[PDB]
Amino acid sequence: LYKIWLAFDPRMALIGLGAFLFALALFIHYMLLRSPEFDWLLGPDYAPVTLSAGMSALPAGR
Amino acid sequence: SMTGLTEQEAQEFHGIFVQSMTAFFGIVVIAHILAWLWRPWL
Amino acid sequence: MTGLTEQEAQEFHGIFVQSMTAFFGIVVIAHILAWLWRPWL
Amino acid sequence: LTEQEAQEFHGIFVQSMTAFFGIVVIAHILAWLWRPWL
Amino acid sequence: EAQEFHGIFVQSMTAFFGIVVIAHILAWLWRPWL
Amino acid sequence: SMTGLTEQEAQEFHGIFVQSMTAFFGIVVIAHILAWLWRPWL
Amino acid sequence: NSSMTGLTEQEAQEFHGIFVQSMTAFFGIVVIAHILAWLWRPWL
Amino acid sequence: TGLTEQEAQEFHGIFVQSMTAFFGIVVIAHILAWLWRPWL
Amino acid sequence: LTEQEAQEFHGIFVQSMTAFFGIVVIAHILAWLWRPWL
Amino acid sequence: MHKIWQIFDPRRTLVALFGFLFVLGLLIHFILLSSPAFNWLSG
Amino acid sequence: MHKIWQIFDPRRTLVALFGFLFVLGLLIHFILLSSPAFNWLSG
Amino acid sequence: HKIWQIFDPRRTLVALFGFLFVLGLLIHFILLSSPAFNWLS
Amino acid sequence: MHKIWQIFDPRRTLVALFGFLFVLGLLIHFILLSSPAFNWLSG
Amino acid sequence: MHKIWQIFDPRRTLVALFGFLFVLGLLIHFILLSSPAFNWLSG
Amino acid sequence: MHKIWQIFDPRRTLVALFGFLFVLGLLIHFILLSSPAFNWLSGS
Amino acid sequence: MHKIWQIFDPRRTLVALFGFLFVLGLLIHFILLSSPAFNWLSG
Amino acid sequence: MTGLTEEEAKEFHGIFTQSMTMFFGIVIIAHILAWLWRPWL
Amino acid sequence: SMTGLTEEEAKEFHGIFTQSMTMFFGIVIIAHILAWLWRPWL
Amino acid sequence: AMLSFERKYRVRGGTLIGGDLFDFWVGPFYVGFFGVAGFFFALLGVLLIVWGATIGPNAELQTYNIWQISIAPPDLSYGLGMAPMTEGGLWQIITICAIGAFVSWALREVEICRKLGIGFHIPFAFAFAIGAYLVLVVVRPILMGAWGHGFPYGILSHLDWVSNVGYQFLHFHYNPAHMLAITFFFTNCLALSMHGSLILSVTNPQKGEEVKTSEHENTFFRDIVGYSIGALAIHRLGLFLALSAVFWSAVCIVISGPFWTRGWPEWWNWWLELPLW
Amino acid sequence: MSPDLWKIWLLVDPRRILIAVFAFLTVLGLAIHMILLSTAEFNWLEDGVP
Amino acid sequence: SPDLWKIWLLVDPRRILIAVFAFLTVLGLAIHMILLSTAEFNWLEDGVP
Amino acid sequence: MSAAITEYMDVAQLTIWAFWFFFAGLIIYLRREDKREGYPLDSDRTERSGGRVKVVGFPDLAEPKTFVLPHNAGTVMAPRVEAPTSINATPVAPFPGAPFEPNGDPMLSGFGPSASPDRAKHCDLTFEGLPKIVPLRVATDFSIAERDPDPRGMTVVGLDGEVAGTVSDVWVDRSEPQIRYLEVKVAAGGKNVLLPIGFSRFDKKARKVKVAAIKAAHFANVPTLAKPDQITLYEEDKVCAYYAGGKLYATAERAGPLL
Numbered sequence A: 001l002y003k004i005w006l007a008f009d010p011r012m013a014l015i016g017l018g019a020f021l022f023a024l025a026l027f028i029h030y031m032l033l034r035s036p037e038f039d040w041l042l043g044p045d046y047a048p049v050t051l052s053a054g055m056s057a058l059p060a061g062r
Numbered sequence B, F: 001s002m003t004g005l006t007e008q009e010a011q012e013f014h015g016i017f018v019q020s021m022t023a024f025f026g027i028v029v030i031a032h033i034l035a036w037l038w039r040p041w042l
Numbered sequence C: 001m002t003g004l005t006e007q008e009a010q011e012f013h014g015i016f017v018q019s020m021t022a023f024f025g026i027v028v029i030a031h032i033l034a035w036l037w038r039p040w041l
Numbered sequence D, I: 001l002t003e004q005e006a007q008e009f010h011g012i013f014v015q016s017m018t019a020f021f022g023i024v025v026i027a028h029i030l031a032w033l034w035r036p037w038l
Numbered sequence E: 001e002a003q004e005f006h007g008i009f010v011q012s013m014t015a016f017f018g019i020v021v022i023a024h025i026l027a028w029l030w031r032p033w034l
Numbered sequence G: 001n002s003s004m005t006g007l008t009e010q011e012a013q014e015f016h017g018i019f020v021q022s023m024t025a026f027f028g029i030v031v032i033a034h035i036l037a038w039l040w041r042p043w044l
Numbered sequence H: 001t002g003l004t005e006q007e008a009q010e011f012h013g014i015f016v017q018s019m020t021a022f023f024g025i026v027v028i029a030h031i032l033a034w035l036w037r038p039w040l
Numbered sequence J, K, M, N, P: 001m002h003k004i005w006q007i008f009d010p011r012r013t014l015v016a017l018f019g020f021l022f023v024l025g026l027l028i029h030f031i032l033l034s035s036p037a038f039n040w041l042s043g
Numbered sequence L: 001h002k003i004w005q006i007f008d009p010r011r012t013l014v015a016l017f018g019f020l021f022v023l024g025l026l027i028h029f030i031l032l033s034s035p036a037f038n039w040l041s
Numbered sequence O: 001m002h003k004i005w006q007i008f009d010p011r012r013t014l015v016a017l018f019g020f021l022f023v024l025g026l027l028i029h030f031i032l033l034s035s036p037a038f039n040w041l042s043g044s
Numbered sequence Q: 001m002t003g004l005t006e007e008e009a010k011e012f013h014g015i016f017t018q019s020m021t022m023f024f025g026i027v028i029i030a031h032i033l034a035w036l037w038r039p040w041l
Numbered sequence R: 001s002m003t004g005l006t007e008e009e010a011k012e013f014h015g016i017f018t019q020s021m022t023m024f025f026g027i028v029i030i031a032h033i034l035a036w037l038w039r040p041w042l
Numbered sequence S: 001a002m003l004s005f006e007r008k009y010r011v012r013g014g015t016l017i018g019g020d021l022f023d024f025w026v027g028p029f030y031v032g033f034f035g036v037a038g039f040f041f042a043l044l045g046v047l048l049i050v051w052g053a054t055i056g057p058n059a060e061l062q063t064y065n066i067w068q069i070s071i072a073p074p075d076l077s078y079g080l081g082m083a084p085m086t087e088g089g090l091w092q093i094i095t096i097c098a099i100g101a102f103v104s105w106a107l108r109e110v111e112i113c114r115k116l117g118i119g120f121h122i123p124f125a126f127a128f129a130i131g132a133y134l135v136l137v138v139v140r141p142i143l144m145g146a147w148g149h150g151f152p153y154g155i156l157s158h159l160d161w162v163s164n165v166g167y168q169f170l171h172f173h174y175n176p177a178h179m180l181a182i183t184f185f186f187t188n189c190l191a192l193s194m195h196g197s198l199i200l201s202v203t204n205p206q207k208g209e210e211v212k213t214s215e216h217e218n219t220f221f222r223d224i225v226g227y228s229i230g231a232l233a234i235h236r237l238g239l240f241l242a243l244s245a246v247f248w249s250a251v252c253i254v255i256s257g258p259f260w261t262r263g264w265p266e267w268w269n270w271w272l273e274l275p276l277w
Numbered sequence T: 001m002s003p004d005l006w007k008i009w010l011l012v013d014p015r016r017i018l019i020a021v022f023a024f025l026t027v028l029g030l031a032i033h034m035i036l037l038s039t040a041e042f043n044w045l046e047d048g049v050p
Numbered sequence U: 001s002p003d004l005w006k007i008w009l010l011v012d013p014r015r016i017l018i019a020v021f022a023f024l025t026v027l028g029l030a031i032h033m034i035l036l037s038t039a040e041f042n043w044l045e046d047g048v049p
Numbered sequence V: 001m002s003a004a005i006t007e008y009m010d011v012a013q014l015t016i017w018a019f020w021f022f023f024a025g026l027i028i029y030l031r032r033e034d035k036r037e038g039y040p041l042d043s044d045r046t047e048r049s050g051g052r053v054k055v056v057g058f059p060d061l062a063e064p065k066t067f068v069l070p071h072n073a074g075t076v077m078a079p080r081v082e083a084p085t086s087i088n089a090t091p092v093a094p095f096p097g098a099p100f101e102p103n104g105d106p107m108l109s110g111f112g113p114s115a116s117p118d119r120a121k122h123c124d125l126t127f128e129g130l131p132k133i134v135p136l137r138v139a140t141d142f143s144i145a146e147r148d149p150d151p152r153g154m155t156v157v158g159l160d161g162e163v164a165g166t167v168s169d170v171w172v173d174r175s176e177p178q179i180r181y182l183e184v185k186v187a188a189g190g191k192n193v194l195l196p197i198g199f200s201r202f203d204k205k206a207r208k209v210k211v212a213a214i215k216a217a218h219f220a221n222v223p224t225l226a227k228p229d230q231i232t233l234y235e236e237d238k239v240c241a242y243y244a245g246g247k248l249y250a251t252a253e254r255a256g257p258l259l
């Protein structure tokens, strides 16, 4: 499908595609960091702290 | 002829654009297979 | 269009590929050493 | 902009659209197996 | 020509409304709202 | 007058406008009759 | 020359005729609506 | 201000006369105000 | 602006200032009678 | 009173008049809906 | 009434009317959706 | 069928397609706001 | 002092003076209203 | 249907269409993540 | 003494003097109203 | 493949790349330092 | 200084006086009805 | 001159301006007499 | 109506979308496609604001006092989903209408720029104001994870939102991007008064004086501060100061909560903890 | 008020005065109705009568 | 003043009428609102009758 | 003196209301200053009444103010009255608010983006009375900064990349030392035309001036000046407006719409 490169500048198409893919990769990595399930920066041996004796991590709200 | 590439220049660009895309996609598939083994999401 | 000839582009790409491979070689070794030290997955 | 370069675009456009819809259907069938929403 | 276009503009709407009617029939079967 | 339309074509537009407006009002009246049967508001 | 709007006596008379007739029909519907509203729920 | 002494004498005459009239009813207002509620 | 107008304005300015100061002196005498501040 | 249309442009008057009536009509309906005594949609 | 189109051009009027009717239709539906007694999506 | 002599049929399709898509989005979001008709639960 | 209008424009001076007197009239009235001793609007 | 590409420029049409499909695709993924029942990055 | 008006413009001096005196007179009245000893609007 | 350098200027694409890699390297090290699981300077 | 002749100034004044008087007439009737409904003084 | 108004026009305007102002003051005086009867403030 | 020199500029074309269909004027306004879309985006948003005022927080607190009218976003418990119309859903629709109206207004300015053959600085500058609004109601709420982080639509209630968001960081003055944004705002106001004064003092000179020249403008501020930026560059500077203030204000609020959760004075502990002291 | 009260329309434009008076009266009428609605004594929609 | 009509030779007796009518209306609005603010002269909330 | 004026009124409330009266008066003043240009308005309201109704809105117009131009160039009144001008275009549709289609060649129509008023036919003068916008051939003490590329000798290309000419000279503002125009020698008839710096995109690496406004063939119809070494305010507007028309008239695609 060479027709695409007849109508789109190869330098601008690669700059746009490269920036898009890099932005997409950064966004998806962050989306995994948002979820603690896939937050690999917590460490492979991550264990959530155990709450005992009526502990609550957060104050009560609404 | 909007940019200036002929029928030959455009086909040469498309020839390795697919090859680079295939190389990029192949690494992506390996990455997701490894990602699935580490921690499946579905 | 830039000015580099096709032959001159071969000279840059050959050095670029070898230099990129050398940088990736050190990077791969660094991650292999990092994995041996403390695996992150 | 004539029929010669307008019929060629339609053939590529429909082929891409059918291929795009084909895998879209596969995605939704797989999504339905994973977690039906109805 | 305002008549030739009207022959295909209206023709498209009937296909769209038919799918719309089918979707609403299925939606009613899934969950009635009245 | 101050629109660029004559009396003949303004009359022609008025006929199509009225007939379309009447059909819209007819569907509306049926809609409110059904709405009143479903749940009266007065 | 002309009037402040460029309308003659006949043009002003003609528009006024349609205007007061449309305004009369609008006020007629308004009066009926307020009679119905008063029957539904008197406010005074 | 491009106002010669010819027209600067009757404007002043009215201005003084109007000022005296304005000051005349001001004094009456203050006399009434003083009778209503003296402030000193 | 000229030299001759300077004495003309000065005479009216001095008299106007003198009249203004005269009322001021009377007001302060009355103010002192009403409620002395020293 | 037909001479008011030699003072006011009929087109500019109707747009101003129709726009005002529509806003006035919305305003009164909103005012009634804001009072529970005349809100016809509460039940 | 056909002379109203000699005052209001059918270009600006026909698209303004359709927009006003659509916003009016949306507003009334939103008003009913906001009224618990007439919210048909409440279940 | 005379509507096309006052509305350009090529500009109208873009506005028509923009209108219908926006309307379809609004209805889906309204249904999602309704717990009775929220299908993503 | 009739010569004072050689340097002061009668139109500019008059309107400025009347505006000055009005705000002074407002200021003094309001100052009296703020004073409970001279407030004539209270019972 | 096939001649519709003479009126709408295929380059601009494709650019707008892909921008639409990309934004729509993000929106649907965003909706599913926002809903806890279909958030696949949890559980 | 009369020579002062050669350099100082009488038109500009008068308006500045009147503005200065009014502000000064306004300031002093406000200062006295602030002081309870000389506030004549307190009724005492 | 070598023909990509006829498109992009080799000088600008090396300053941009080296600066990008340096920023990326700094970013990743700072990310790991801020992570208690991977901070290597805590002893 | 308005472009209005002597006759139009009198003619406008005549209709203006009637329209103002009729408007004042309706206002008075409204206030009489308002006073009967709920006097404010 | 300054306002484009002649000496005769200013005489004409002043007479009716005074008449209108006098009648406006007359309504005001009646209003304040009624206000004083309704609720005096002094 | 149109200005006495305007008729020669009312040309067809330059529309981004719609072509000849919406290319016309209503009174002084140019509408175009985005004027139609922008008007009905604004009309629906305003009508839903009035309806939101009509139902109010509840029946007893409902008020038409323009200061007290408030349309609040959803509770944070709804996250990024849609809320019921009376529980913040109205705010979500109004926000969408506001975004539609603002973007349509910006795009209508683009079409006006194309008609007049002028630069696109004005729509570009307006995009910064839109971007600041988008940060407040879209970007920051999405980063925070709930539409309830948007500010309520009320003349005084959105001030209560600003106050409480500010005190969520215990002392919001220590926000470094806030300090930079305020510096640009204050500098812009100073630069605007200087520029307005200089233009007015030159074109309206002393009594019995001719209009001054560009030399007088350059000489005036060189006599005061020793530097004159120039007649063209003061408009670059004013645009830069105004846009930088909004850019850094968008930064200051988007880092408050998403990228910083402690009190803002505590952020400066990086400086206090330098080993130099 | 003298047979010369019509002279005012030689001074002030009748059309601009008519627009001004209509706009002023409409705003004044809205203002007075809103003021009355803001008082518990004269809010006829919430007095409960009848 | 023997000749007060001369005022209309320096102030236009058209913008004066507009200014006077606007000024009197605003002053009339202000005094009514001032009385409404007063617990004694508020005729809408005084309960009389 | 107290903070309370009545039971409900207080000083702060009076002060804010006092501001609104001032602010209302200020807006009226500013709107009056706004209407010193382009008023009374041009409208079908005036056209249909034969000039009997002037459209000025509210506030009405202010009294004329005088600008005494330096070097006795005349006194210009801001709220002036200009002669009626006929546009070089026809309406696309007869309804009010409809746009106009320029007659003939749009670039040479003098309508729309190429429209321009008739400014004074005299040069803008420096503080000393010398012409302000002059070429570098007569502003001898003026020179290009050392670190910047000299525009002279650069190639001028149009919207389509076609060569239009070379920069023969640079025109600078003498009062504020900046470049205003590039004098371009058209390589079609050897006639020098001015190119405003605002329509010039310098390409330092290739020593090329890119003009996106117009094509290379359009440089032949750029308005020219009577005197080769000075330009009047009248001619400055004509030159700049011609390039501005290119932003809408140079190509068919520039009239839009995108879709």
Ligand code: BCL
Binding pocket: Q041, R020, R021, R023, R024, R027, R028, R029, R031, R032, R035, T032, U021, U022, U024, U025, U027, U028, U029, U032, U035, U041, U043
């Ligand atoms: C507080 C005790 C009383 C009360 C005590 C007073 C007292 C005392 C006065 C008023 C006056 C007025 N009151 Mg009251 N008033 C009360 C409650 C109200 C209420 C209300 C809904 O509660 C309203 C709407 C009014 C309204 C009015 C206006 C009719 C009038 C001020 C008009 C003006 O400023 O013209 C100024 C603007 C103009 C343009 C004037 C033009 C003059 C022209 C040249 C003369 C002919 C006029 C022409 C025919 C047009 C008619 C306009 C009239 C001024 C109405 N009052 C309460 C109940 N009221 C004042 C009055 O009587 O004015 C006539 C006055 O002195």
Ligand code: BCL
Binding pocket: G022, G025, G026, G029, G030, G031, G033, G034, G037, J018, J019, J021, J022, J024, J025, J026, J029, J032, J038, J040, K028
């Ligand atoms: C107590 C509350 C009652 C109620 C009591 C009343 C009362 C009382 C009245 C209305 C009136 C109206 N009600 Mg209701 N109404 C209620 C609930 C509703 C609801 C709803 C969803 O709940 C809706 C949508 C409406 C809608 C309406 C409108 C049909 C109408 C106001 C139109 C207008 O403002 O024109 C103004 C806008 C325009 C004129 C713009 C015109 C646009 C076009 C371009 C011009 C064409 C003019 C045409 C040629 C002539 C017009 C008149 C014709 C003879 C028809 N009501 C409840 C149940 N309603 C009023 C009415 O009947 O008016 C007719 C009225 O007096």
Ligand code: BCL
Binding pocket: H017, H018, H019, H021, H022, H025, H026, H027, H029, H030, H033, M018, M019, M021, M022, M023, M024, M025, M026, M029, M032, M038, M040, U001, U004, U031
């Ligand atoms: C606090 C005790 C009293 C009271 C004590 C006083 C005292 C003391 C005074 C007033 C004065 C005034 N009071 Mg009081 N006043 C009270 C409460 C009120 C209330 C109210 C709402 O209760 C109102 C509306 C007023 C209103 C007024 C004004 C009539 C007047 C301020 C005029 C002015 O500001 O000129 C500023 C504006 C101008 C100067 C504009 C110029 C235009 C006018 C027409 C100038 C004309 C000049 C000359 C007279 C023309 C005539 C010439 C001949 C016809 C030839 N008072 C209370 C009840 N009042 C002052 C007064 O009497 O002034 C006359 C005054 O000294």
Ligand code: BCL
Binding pocket: A004, A020, A028, B042, D020, D023, D024, D025, D027, D028, D031, N014, N015, N018, N019, N021, N022, N024, N025, N026, N029, N032, N040
């Ligand atoms: C929720 C259950 C599943 C899931 C259910 C589904 C379902 C059902 C579907 C997808 C689909 C997709 N999913 Mg999924 N998906 C999930 C999780 C993910 C995750 C993730 C990290 O978790 C990612 C990254 C994706 C990503 C994707 C995409 C591959 C795909 C949407 C493509 C698209 O929108 O085309 C639109 C974009 C374009 C067409 C290109 C846009 C071009 C650019 C961006 C715009 C500018 C245009 C430019 C200027 C000009 C271009 C012109 C041409 C170059 C000539 N999914 C979860 C796990 N997913 C859809 C699919 O299969 O599509 C193929 C689909 O139907």
Ligand code: BCL
Binding pocket: C019, C022, C023, C026, C027, C028, C030, C031, C034, P017, P018, P021, P022, P024, P025, P026, P029, P032, P038, P040
């Ligand atoms: C967190 C776990 C480990 C750790 C895990 C890793 C991992 C995994 C990696 C690194 C990498 C790096 N680490 Mg470490 N690293 C740690 C802690 C540190 C500390 C510290 C004080 O604690 C420091 C200073 C560093 C520093 C470094 C750099 C040497 C290197 C980043 C390269 C880069 O940014 O490219 C930017 C620079 C360029 C792009 C220049 C390009 C040069 C090219 C290749 C050609 C020039 C070649 C040569 C230099 C010159 C010859 C030819 C010349 C042109 C004349 N690490 C901790 C202890 N680190 C990366 C690496 O090894 O890269 C090589 C890497 O992948």
Ligand code: BCL
Binding pocket: G044, J028, Q018, Q019, Q020, Q022, Q023, Q026, Q027, Q028, Q030, Q031, Q034, T022, T025, T026, T028, T029, T030, T033, T036, T042, T044
């Ligand atoms: C105490 C509260 C009372 C009440 C007491 C009063 C009193 C008292 C008055 C009104 C008046 C009005 N009331 Mg009410 N009113 C109440 C409740 C309402 C409600 C409601 C939904 O509850 C509404 C919509 C209204 C609305 C109205 C309007 C009909 C009218 C104000 C019109 C105006 O401002 O003209 C301003 C706009 C113009 C003047 C422009 C029009 C110019 C025209 C063309 C003049 C032409 C003259 C020509 C000869 C024809 C003359 C006909 C008349 C002018 C009608 N009332 C409650 C029940 N109401 C006023 C009135 O009666 O006015 C007539 C009035 O004095």
Ligand code: BCL
Binding pocket: S102, S129, S130, S132, S133, S135, S136, S161, S162, S163, S164, S165, S166, S167, S171, S172, S173, S178, S181, S182, S185, S245, S246, S248, S249, S250, S251, S252, S253
């Ligand atoms: C206790 C509170 C804290 C504090 C907490 C906050 C919080 C929270 C915020 C700020 C924000 C700001 N603060 Mg702070 N701030 C404090 C004290 C200050 C002080 C001071 C003197 O103490 C100053 C000068 C400031 C200054 C600032 C600015 C930097 C910034 C607001 C401008 C802005 O965002 O533009 C942006 C402009 C817009 C968003 C306008 C958008 C315009 C839209 C596109 C157009 C709308 C059109 C409209 C509907 C038209 C209507 C039609 C009409 C008819 C005309 N803050 C105190 C210490 N501050 C805000 C910020 O930075 O936001 C980005 C912000 O959220």
Ligand SMILES: CC[C@H]1c2cc3[nH]c4c(c3C)C(=O)[C@H](C(=O)OC)c4c3nc(cc4[nH]c(cc(n2)[C@@H]1C)c(C(C)=O)c4C)[C@@H](C)[C@@H]3CCC(=O)OC/C=C(\C)CCC[C@H](C)CCC[C@H](C)CCCC(C)C
Binding pocket: S038, S041, S042, S043, S044, S045, S046, S094, S095, S097, S098, S099, S101, S102, S105, S109, S122, S123, S125, S126, S128, S129, S152, S153, S154, S155, S158, S242, S243, S246
């Ligand atoms: C970025 C630098 C500064 C800037 C620039 C700027 N603003 C601009 C422009 C530019 C260059 C325009 O060209 C454009 C314009 O037309 O100006 C006259 C505009 C404009 N900036 C405006 C306002 C504005 N700008 C602000 C700020 C700023 N504008 C920055 C400080 C603010 C602030 C700080 O509060 C306001 C209020 C408008 C006057 C105008 C844009 C008009 C517009 O978009 O019209 C469309 C919308 C309507 C006609 C009505 C609103 C419709 C909505 C659906 C209603 C709901 C709104 C909101 C969500 C709720 C209510 C808000 C509550 C907080 C009360």
Ligand SMILES: [Ca+2]
Binding pocket: G042, G043, G044, T043, T044, T045, T046, T047, T048, T049, T050
């Ligand atoms: Ca009642």
Ligand SMILES: [Ca+2]
Binding pocket: Q039, Q040, Q041, U042, U043, U044, U045, U046, U047, U048, U049
């Ligand atoms: Ca009472």
